[PDB]
From a paper:
The interaction between NOT1 and CAF1/POP2 connects the NOT module to the catalytic module and thus is central to the assembly of the CCR4–NOT complex. Given the crucial role of this interaction, we have solved the crystal structures of the isolated CAF1-binding domain of human NOT1 (residues 1093–1317) at 2.90 Å resolution and its complex with CAF1 (i.e. CNOT7) at 2.70 Å resolution. The structures reveal that the CAF1-binding domain of NOT1 adopts an MIF4G fold; thus, this domain was termed the NOT1 MIF4G domain. CAF1 (i.e. CNOT7) and POP2 (i.e. CNOT8) are one-domain proteins that adopt an RNase D-like fold.
Author numbering:
A (entry chain A): 1089 to 1317
B (entry chain B): 10 to 266, 274 to 280
The structure:
């Protein structure tokens, strides 16, 4: 529906069958059979129609971007990623919306891979992860459920990065907010678990983190720049 | 209002501004102040090829930064309206920390308020956290201007990595290039400018520059560094600098091959 069906299936076929071996083939297929002008749309297709739903192939799709070696395209993909994360983060949330949360998680994982994993920062003007967590904390369980798993997924990609790998001060700043949320008595079972798992993935001892007293600022919580709806 | 003084209480507030000027002003001129040098590394001899770095590492791991000064500029050497230079003042405690006696006296003479630093100084790890995601580091497009600055970047790397510096000089540059893709060390460039020699203040005088603010403080030094670059670029380099020739080479260290330490 975003592209006329002929041009649509043409690029659907590039990513339809993708592998380690046919990688360089498919990257040339794309470079020739598709016009440069459609690349912003190829970038939407990749983020929305593939990456969002199939987390099993994120390494492949990342290898693709690597092989393609196109920075202006890589930039498009990063903006598309942020745009969609925004839509979901400012959506009408409901207990029932499992699908929306799944998409946000995958888009989180993907964001980690194309920024952190590649020694590039998640810019404060694009996304303020620390404030997202605190805002989630004041708005409710629902918002937390939408946000903690999502933040976990993006941080998973810090271990693979000489820059953000612990004990990076930003990475550890985020981890310390999570460590404080984990101390909260009425934090859903599944999110205490999600946070625990994240520590093991980063080879961290949850108990050695240094929780702060941010959740008690109140005055600060009242003045956050909202990133949620 | 040309040079803003930053402490703990107004760091968050000023980063908010820096976050924005970096977009339009991608040239960053920098200088630090710290308690000098107190030691020579054990087991290393001056004759070693990497001795200058090993001497840097030895003292940076051991001592705490006292001031960072950042001055923002653009392609043509213009400044943003209002403040163009921020002077970050870091937590420092003369009872607890280490220092070379002379440096504290010189820094004191220059106007450093050591008691205010002890009480209202910025924590360096919190400062790293905020710099990390501000566009001022790690991002392409930005360009760092410096002066005899091996030790300056050693502190910035120590702060951004929250770790001791890498054992080997090779490794220090690898991680250095990630945080700071493009660096120009005016004192390095000066090795190609007949009749330009000396410290920052001396070079400032030969180039007929007018220093704004207190000498031997970071903010003012960074702004003078900034001026010395854009003035030197037109006068000796025809308003263009060859990356392959000059980018990334810090004065006194092994890249671009004579003391790394900015003696007085
Ligand atoms: Cl320090
Ligand atoms: Mg200096
Ligand atoms: Mg050795
Ligand atoms: Mg100085």
């Amino acid at each position: 529906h975003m592209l006329e069906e002929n041009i649509q299936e043409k690029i659907a076929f590039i990513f339809n069958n993708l592998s380690q071996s046919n990688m360089t083939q498919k990257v040339e297929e794309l470079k020739e059979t598709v016009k440069e002008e459609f690349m912003p749309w190829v970038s939407q297709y990749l983020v929305m129609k593939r990456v969002s739903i199939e987390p099993n192939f994120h390494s492949l799709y990342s290898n693709f971007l690597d092989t393609l070696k196109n920075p202006e395209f890589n930039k498009m993909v990063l903006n598309e990623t942020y745009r969609n994360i925004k839509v979901l983060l400012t959506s009408d949330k409901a207990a029932a919306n499992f699908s929306d949360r799944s998409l946000l998680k995958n888009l989180g994982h993907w964001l980690g891979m194309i920024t952190l994993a590649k020694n590039k920062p998640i810019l404060h003007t694009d996304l303020d992860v620390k404030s997202l967590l605190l805002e989630a904390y004041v708005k409710g369980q629902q918002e937390l459920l939408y946000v903690v798993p999502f933040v976990a997924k993006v941080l998973e990609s810090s271990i693979r990065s000489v820059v953000f790998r612990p004990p990076n001060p930003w990475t550890m700043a985020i981890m310390n907010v999570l460590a404080e949320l984990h101390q909260e008595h009425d934090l859903k079972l599944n999110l205490k678990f999600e946070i625990e798992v994240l520590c093991k993935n980063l080879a961290l001892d949850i108990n050695e983190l240094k929780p702060g007293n941010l959740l008690k600022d109140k005055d600060r919580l009242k003045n956050l720049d909202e990133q949620l709806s | 209002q040309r040079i803003c003084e930053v402490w703990a209480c107004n760091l968050d507030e000023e980063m908010k501004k820096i976050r924005q000027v970096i977009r339009k002003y991608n040239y960053v001129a920098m200088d630090t102040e710290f308690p000098g040098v107190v030691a020579r590394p054990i087991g290393e001899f001056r004759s070693n090829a990497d001795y200058q770095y090993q001497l840097l590492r030895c003292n940076v791991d051991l001592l705490k930064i006292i001031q960072l000064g950042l001055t923002f500029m653009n392609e043509q050497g213009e400044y943003p309206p209002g403040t163009s230079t921020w002077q970050f003042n870091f937590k420092f405690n003369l009872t607890e920390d280490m220092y070379a006696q002379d440096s504290i006296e010189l820094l004191t003479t220059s106007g450093i308020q050591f008691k205010k630093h002890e009480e209202e100084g910025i924590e360096t790890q919190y400062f790293a956290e905020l710099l990390m995601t501000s566009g001022v580091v790690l991002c392409e497009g930005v360009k760092w201007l410096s002066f005899h600055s091996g030790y300056d970047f050693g502190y910035l790397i120590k702060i951004l990595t929250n770790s001791n510096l890498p054992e080997e000089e090779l490794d220090f540059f690898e991680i250095l290039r990630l945080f700071f893709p493009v660096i120009y060390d005016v004192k390095y460039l000066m090795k190609s400018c007949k009749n330009l020699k000396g410290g920052l203040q001396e070079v400032a005088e030969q180039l007929e520059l007018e220093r704004i603010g207190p000498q031997h403080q970071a903010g003012s030094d960074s702004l003078l560094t900034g001026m010395a670059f854009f003035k030197m670029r037109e006068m000796f380099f025809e308003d263009h600098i060859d990356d392959a020739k000059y980018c990334g080479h810090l004065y006194g260290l092994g890249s671009g091959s004579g003391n790394a330490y900015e003696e007085e």
